[PDB]
Amino acid sequence: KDGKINLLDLNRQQMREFFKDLGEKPFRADQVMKWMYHYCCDNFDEMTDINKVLRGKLKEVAEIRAPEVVEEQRSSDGTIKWAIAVGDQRVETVYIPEDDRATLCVSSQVGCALECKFCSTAQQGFNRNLRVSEIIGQVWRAAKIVGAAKVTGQRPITNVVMMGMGEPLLNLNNVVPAMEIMLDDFGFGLSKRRVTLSTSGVVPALDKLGDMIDVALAISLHAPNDEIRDEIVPINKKYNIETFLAAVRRYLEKSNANQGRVTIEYVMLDHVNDGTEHAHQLAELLKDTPCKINLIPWNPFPGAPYGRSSNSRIDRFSKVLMSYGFTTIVRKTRGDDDVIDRTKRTLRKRM
Numbered sequence: 001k002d003g004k005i006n007l008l009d010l011n012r013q014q015m016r017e018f019f020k021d022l023g024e025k026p027f028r029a030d031q032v033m034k035w036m037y038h039y040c041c042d043n044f045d046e047m048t049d050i051n052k053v054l055r056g057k058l059k060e061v062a063e064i065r066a067p068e069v070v071e072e073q074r075s076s077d078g079t080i081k082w083a084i085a086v087g088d089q090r091v092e093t094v095y096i097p098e099d100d101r102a103t104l105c106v107s108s109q110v111g112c113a114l115e116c117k118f119c120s121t122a123q124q125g126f127n128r129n130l131r132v133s134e135i136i137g138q139v140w141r142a143a144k145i146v147g148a149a150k151v152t153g154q155r156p157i158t159n160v161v162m163m164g165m166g167e168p169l170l171n172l173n174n175v176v177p178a179m180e181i182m183l184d185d186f187g188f189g190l191s192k193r194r195v196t197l198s199t200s201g202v203v204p205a206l207d208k209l210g211d212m213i214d215v216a217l218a219i220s221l222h223a224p225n226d227e228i229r230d231e232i233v234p235i236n237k238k239y240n241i242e243t244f245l246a247a248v249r250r251y252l253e254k255s256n257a258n259q260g261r262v263t264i265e266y267v268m269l270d271h272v273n274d275g276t277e278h279a280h281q282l283a284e285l286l287k288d289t290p291c292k293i294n295l296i297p298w299n300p301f302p303g304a305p306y307g308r309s310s311n312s313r314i315d316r317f318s319k320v321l322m323s324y325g326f327t328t329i330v331r332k333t334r335g336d337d338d339v340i341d342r343t344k345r346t347l348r349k350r351m
């Protein structure tokens with residue numbers, strides 16, 4: 001807004017290049033980056049080992065502006081759901097704590113174009129791609145809130161997943177540098193095994209991803225055959241299951257963050273994809289792809305075309321897969337979470 005460079009938009013190299021233009025040596029960029037990501041600092045004044053002159057330069061041409069929280073919802077089990085303001089739009093960020101880990105689910109887009117029939121985001125349609133600052137800024141903001149204070153169980157973020165609003169492979173230009181910052185020693189310093197990109201299967205973009213970065217891959221499959229997938233996840237019409245699975249294999253040739261084993265996501269949809277015959281078909285489909293299968297007890301929202309699969313159907317589905325020796329997990333569901341308002345506020349201030 002002020003015509004200043006948001007430093008959260010910049011990877012290590014771009015940061016160094018920017019600092020070079022300020023007439024500063026590359027080490028000063030690394031130093032500021034460290035303050036930004038190791039101490040979640042967005043205030044140049046708090047950077048005590050930087051001299052006043054450099055501080056003055058930075059305040060004039062740059063800022064550290066992460067997206068703000070407009071709604072926080074805290075659950076019993078420790079799960080936090082944030083609504084995040086991105087310009088004039090809203091995205092979602094979710095913190096999920098566990099005993100041995102803490103996972104952040106980060107949005108890649110404002111809305112989505114993929115039209116997955118089980119997805120409430122798909123209802124909105126695609127608005128825009130998120131900028132680097134608005135992706136990495138979700139991690140930054142969450143880490144600040146989780147760190148600031150200070151509750152039992154909620155350890156610092158250990159894992160980040162590109163899983164939320166939007167298809168990450170349709171925003172490669174912003175998703176890739178964001179992940180680079182997550183991975184970087186001077187950024188969040190996360191292992192590549194703990195940075196996971198989840199995709200529904202944009203094949204040429206996946207081929208592209210593997211040439212750009214080494215990060216863990218997860219796939220949103222959600223169906224055992226092409227006729228069912230064409231219906232539930234329309235992008236399958238462009239790139240079918242076999243085209244998707246071959247692209248996964250090509251990615252694993254360039255990348256070893258997965259250690260050969262991709263996580264496969266599968267929402268359970270009442271009488272759509274949750275039958276024993278579907279499970280047997282899934283096992284056959286996945287016989288040549290090393291995997292862990294996450295069966296997801298999906299909950300309907302108002303207007304959803306599908307119902308929840310019963311627990312006994314999910315159980316029988318799980319057992320079929322286990323009989324073939326697949327590592328399969330029924331994912332423990334986490335959390336239980338006006339138009340005239342602006343004019344009303346104006347009419348109130350009048351009194």
Ligand code: SF4
Binds near residue numbers: 111120
């Ligand atoms: S890719 Fe993800 S966000 Fe996009 S419509 Fe499908 S499930 Fe929804």
